[PDB]
């Protein structure tokens, strides 16, 4: 039931308390809090409380994630959503890749949030359906800048890639849901999940305040790629206006 591995260096959740706007972070499938650690520092030092939690099995082992289901990732950041209504009278949601599905997810289930921030969120990958092993080998991170070392599992293992895939389908299903404002932004040159995905989101989502924002300098891992600065003062911009 509990994760056998200890937590990585660099994959520790992170929490700050400030003021009455909260702002919830998800990381992605095999990553880590690492991956969301400048947004939300940067969201720290901007005045919001904050929550980036780690997403059970992840941060430890690949083995541990493999003993996980996507209802133990939903369970994180339903735990870490409930941290943040504890606290805050108006939240918000942001998230790379499957923390990117999770906060569609989240949006879907709790009318309450005030507005979500997507960046390259997934629910639509066909390369799964397409693709025998246990454990594949982790496709290098997907970072147009070389010099970031992305915290991330170096082996992903074929059974959480079926849990992954069930998520995004019920994900999927359920965009319409959505009503809150909602920032979508995209990597033209994800290499990761087809960037077609932004359309399905913002076509799929009942909400009538939606954009999506085009990121021309990064790969998948944008959050920790040349364009991180943008993503940053947008986001921030959107909490503002929507508080």
Request: hydrophobic share 40%; net charge negative; with cysteine.
């Amino acid at each position: 039931m509990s994760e056998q591995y200890p937590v990585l260096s660099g994959a520790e959740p992170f929490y700050a308390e400030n003021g009455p706007v909260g702002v919830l972070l998800v990381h992605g499938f095999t990553g880590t809090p690492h991956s969301m650690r400048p947004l939300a520092e940067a969201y720290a030092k901007a005045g919001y409380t904050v929550c980036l939690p780690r997403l059970k099995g992840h941060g430890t082992h690949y083995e541990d994630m493999e003993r996980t289901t996507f209802h133990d990732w939903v369970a994180s950041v339903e735990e870490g959503y409930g941290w943040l209504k504890q606290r805050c009278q108006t939240i918000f949601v942001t998230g790379l890749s499957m923390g990117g599905t999770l906060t569609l997810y989240l949006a879907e289930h709790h009318p309450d949030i005030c507005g979500i921030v997507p960046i390259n969120a997934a629910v639509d990958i066909p390369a799964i359906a397409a693709g025998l092993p246990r454990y594949l080998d982790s496709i290098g991170s997907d970072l147009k800048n070389p010099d970031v070392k992305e915290l991330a599992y170096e082996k992903t293992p074929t059974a959480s890639l079926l849990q992954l895939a069930r998520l995004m389908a019920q994900t999927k299903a359920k965009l319409d849901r959505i009503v809150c404002p909602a920032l979508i932004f995209v990597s033209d040159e994800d290499h990761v999940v087809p960037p077609g995905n932004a359309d399905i989101i913002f076509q799929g989502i009942s909400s009538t305040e939606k954009e999506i924002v085009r990121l021309r300098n990064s790969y998948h891992v944008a959050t920790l790629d040349y364009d991180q600065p943008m993503i940053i003062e947008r986001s921030l911009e959107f909490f503002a206006k929507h508080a």
